Design an enzyme around this catalytic site. Structure first.
Site: not given
Length: 419
Positions: A201, A204, A261, A297, A368
């Protein structure tokens, strides 16, 4: 015991001399005339010993090419690698290791090449030795580790690196970090900073940068409303899953992607720029030819070893984030909006924020993934203002998430201590 050379000869003595004096041409002559490449004097010293410490790269390469014992050991237990590390000859250290040198050779007092490099603070040599499997916990006859010797000699950057490297080895993790001065961009500390890691992430913030760039250009609007359906929701969409009746604005989606996130928020914004390919194009067009996004994602978190999809390097990510937060790539308003979203990060408590000293500023974004992957990118500094960029990635460990969080936090504490 074949590494203890003990044969003398006439041509061998002349070769030993040419190796010390750096007579590149004389060496080639003696070798062409049949000189013993492993000739030895009364101290067990070979021509490769002499060339290694005298820093004559070409002679080292020629000697190895003619069969020189890369692990020759003199009466004190020194190998050519000991001497190359001690005298700071990086390229020779690499050549010796490429030709099979024992990275953990020990002398009579238990000193290894990593001990010697750490004593002198040779950062680049320390990293090469670690990369080739140097034992970070090796103790000499007096119980001294490479860290102990670095610490005793004031080599704190190397000391910091060795403590981070030892902690990662204990976990079975591959780690990389870099610290950049925010204003100048100067690299201040680094470890494995040119190796690829899964972004997770942390991508982003780059996505947000690309959206803000289009807003600056009038091609996107903070207030434009995007509609989506329940079927569009992917896992970990805490904000977007609550706005199925009327959707969300671009600004709201960017805030959710950064501060929470939110995965669907990131996918929706990716669609506006043509998907992962579009974000990679944005990166190329601002000078980042390393960072790449390839998948959506949640698939981009798979973190397959040696897979370059969805990866960055610490230095690439840090340099690109700096360009987004400082300078003219984004307007002052967009610059500040990105920093403000990162300051409002809600889901990175256990990482750098857990070791942030009182009064310090931090704006960050964590990631993560699978295969024990964890990371963070941050702008932080004392006196309530950010002054440096820090990027940290770990991957490949079997550690628990709590252990991964603690590892990131520990690395951050190490960098803050050595500020």
């Amino acid at each position: 015991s074949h590494h203890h050379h003990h044969h003398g000869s006439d041509l061998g003595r002349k070769l030993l001399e040419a190796a010390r004096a750096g007579q590149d041409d004389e060496v080639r002559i003696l070798m062409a005339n049949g000189a013993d490449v492993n000739a030895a004097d009364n101290t067990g010293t070979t021509p490769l010993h002499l060339a290694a410490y005298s820093g004559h790269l070409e002679i080292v390469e020629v000697l190895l090419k003619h069969g020189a014992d890369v692990d020759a050991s003199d009466v004190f237990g020194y190998t050519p690698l000991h001497l190359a590390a001690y005298w700071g000859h990086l390229e020779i250290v690499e050549v010796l290791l490429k030709n099979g040198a024992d990275v953990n050779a020990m002398d009579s007092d238990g000193m290894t090449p990593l001990h010697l490099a750490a004593k002198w603070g040779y950062l680049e040599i320390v990293e090469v030795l670690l990369k080739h499997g140097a034992d970070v916990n090796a103790q000499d006859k007096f119980g001294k580790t490479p860290f102990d010797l670095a610490d005793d000699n004031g080599n704190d950057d190397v000391g910091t690196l060795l403590q981070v490297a030892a902690a990662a080895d204990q976990l079975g993790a591959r780690v990389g970090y870099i610290e950049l001065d925010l204003n100048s961009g100067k690299i201040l500390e680094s470890f494995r900073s040119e190796e690829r890691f899964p972004m997770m992430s942390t991508f982003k913030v780059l996505l947000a940068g690309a959206i803000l760039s289009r807003i600056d250009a009038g091609q996107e609007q903070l207030g434009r409303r995007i509609h989506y359906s329940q079927n569009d929701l992917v896992e970990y969409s805490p904000v977007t899953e609550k706005h199925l009746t009327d959707g969300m604005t671009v600004r709201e989606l960017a805030s959710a992607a950064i501060t929470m996130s939110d995965n669907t928020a990131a996918n929706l914004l990716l669609t506006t720029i043509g998907g992962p390919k579009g974000l990679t194009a944005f990166l190329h067009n601002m000078g980042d030819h390393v960072t790449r996004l390839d998948r959506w994602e949640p698939e981009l978190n798979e973190a397959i070893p040696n897979d370059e999809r969805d990866t960055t390097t610490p230095v690439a990510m840090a340099t690109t984030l700096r360009k987004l937060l400082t300078g003219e790539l984004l307007t002052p308003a967009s610059r500040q909006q990105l920093m403000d979203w990162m300051e409002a990060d809600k889901v990175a408590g256990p990482l750098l924020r857990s070791v942030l000293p009182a009064g310090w500023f931090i704006a960050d974004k964590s990631g993560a993934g699978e295969r024990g992957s964890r990371g963070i990118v941050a702008a932080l500094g004392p006196d309530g203002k950010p002054s440096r960029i820090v990027v940290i990635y770990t991957t490949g460990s079997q550690a628990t998430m709590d252990e991964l969080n603690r590892q990131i936090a520990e690395i951050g504490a190490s960098l803050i201590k050595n500020w």
